[PDB]
Amino acid sequence: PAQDNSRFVIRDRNWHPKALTPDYKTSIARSPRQALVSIPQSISETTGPNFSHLGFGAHDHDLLLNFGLPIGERIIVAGRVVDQYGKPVPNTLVEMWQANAGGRYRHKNDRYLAPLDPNFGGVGRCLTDSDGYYSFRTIKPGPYPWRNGPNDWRPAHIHFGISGPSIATKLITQLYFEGDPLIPMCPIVKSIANPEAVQQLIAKLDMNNANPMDCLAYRFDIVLRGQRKTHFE
């Protein structure tokens, strides 16, 4: 069984987006009004699932083959998972989901007029290697209109979920693409108050990782809460 041997650096709740961010409409009614109650870390919080034994299919991480060929911009999305101290996070679960090339999601509740791609599902998962590396192969998602303000459009993005070493480190975020002019206008992005935090969400074009005459690549590194050993407790 798991043991209480670590402590995690406290979250900066001013760096992350706050709960109540009115421009993002839905947040109004889905945000607590009472303050969060801070509690000391225990075995309950410092442990979490290890996914090393989950049985991954051979194309779990390959959106081009896991659902012919989908239509759209062939890309590889890769990067490293590290902690705040700069330490790699080996064998951790990285899960992603996104829309197709025209901004349509393969979900019943998606009524956007752009059509589905018969060769694309939009789901991937990869366990990080010994060095904290993960990689996915897919098509670049298109932007999509959503009912917030009368003319709001999400910048092209990929949803990410990462486990890390404990429930304490678990995170859900979104990746955006370098240079998309829609970024600065999104109320979701804008839930984040520090522009410097915003930049951490932008994947960079990586010509070094591209496959000539085949596909481009983007680099997206993720940083989880620093892990230290207890001391004088």
Q: Which residues are annotated as a binding site for Fe cation?
A: 105, 144, 157, 159
Q: Are 47 and 107 in contact (CB under 8 A)?
A: no
Residue with tokens 């009524």: 111
53 in active site: no
CA 183/CA 154 separation, integer angstroms: 8
Token duo for residue 24: 């993002």
What is the SS3 assignment for 195? helix
Specify the residue for token string 């590396």: 133
Q: Is 116 in the site for another protein (CB under 8 A)?
A: no
Residue 202 binds which of another protein, a second copy, none (CB < 5-8 A, kind-dependent): none
- Chain mean position to CA 28: 23
| Nearest by Cα to 223 from 76, 49, 86, 125 | 86
Q: Is 102 in the site for another protein (CB under 8 A)?
A: no
223 part of the interface to a second copy, by CB under 8 A: no
Residue selected from 1, 3, 35, 55 as contacting a second copy according to rule CB under 8 A: 35
Enumerate the β-bridge partners of residue 222.
81
Residues 108-147 that bind a second copy (CB under 8 A): 112-115, 117, 135, 137, 139-140, 142-143, 145, 147
Active site residue 105: yes
**Diameter over CA atoms, the chain:** 60
Q: Which of the residues are catalytic? A: 105, 144, 154, 157, 159
Binding site residues, a second copy, CB under 8 A:
9-10, 13-14, 22-23, 25-26, 28-29, 33-35, 38-40, 62, 68-69, 71-74, 76, 84, 100-103, 112-115, 117, 135, 137, 139-140, 142-143, 145, 147-151, 153, 178-182, 185, 204-205, 207-216, 226, 228, 231-233
